């Protein structure tokens, strides 16, 4: 074990953050007249009362959607950066 199994390229998280803020922070003309990130910010705003869960409020769905998107973006960014040094597609 070479102690760098997760080859540390710290630009990956920033690139994924940018690439997930860009699509999520979009004023979609569909039923969501505003953007989903603003809903995921409103949720916490209404849930800042200490010592209490959301209790099936409209906060879990936005949380799950946003964080699944962020995780897939980060994973795909890591794979894309580390596949170029290798020959997975070249």
């Amino acid at each position: 074990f070479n102690r760098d199994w997760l080859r540390k390229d710290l630009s990956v998280i920033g690139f994924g953050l940018i690439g997930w803020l860009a699509p999520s922070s979009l004023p979609v003309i569909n039923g969501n007249s505003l953007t989903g990130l603003f809903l995921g910010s409103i949720g916490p705003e209404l849930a800042h009362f200490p010592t209490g869960p959301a209790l099936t409020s409209p906060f879990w769905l936005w949380m799950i959607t946003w964080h699944v998107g962020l995780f897939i973006v980060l994973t795909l960014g890591q794979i894309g950066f580390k596949g170029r040094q290798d020959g997975y597609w070249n």
Binding site: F1, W5, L6, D86, Y88
Partner: protein, 163 residues
Amino acid sequence: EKYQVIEPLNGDPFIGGFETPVTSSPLIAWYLSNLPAYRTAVAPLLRGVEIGLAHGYLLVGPFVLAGPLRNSAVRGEAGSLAAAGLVTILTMCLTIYGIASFKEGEASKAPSLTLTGRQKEADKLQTAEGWASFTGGWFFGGLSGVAWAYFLLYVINLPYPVK
């Protein structure tokens, strides 16, 4: 010819193990190396004290919040006594395990070779007197941890969410 994160155990393909991030990550390996069980140079008594303290402290809670007297006014005392009794039973378990496993006057059979090959000294925890000291320290630490958890929870009544 790719990166190939996964590697055999210490490079030996014929030992029954693997090198995974779960196994030997720098953070996971650092965490496991500094646990009291794996501090071979430290005396077994102090490692046992730490282990018993942690274990009694964590054991107090479940008995207090799930015991038969959890709806009574002696809930804290009942849970603490249950944790202490479990600690005592586990002390008997450790004592009999040491009696059966180790014989007085024998050298330790614990692995004395590191992954690199430094060939350090064998751990004294795997000895009759080492295990006896470990058991005594574990008893003392378990009782101390149960007492400390009872004091923090009930005698002092610190504010905690669930209790």
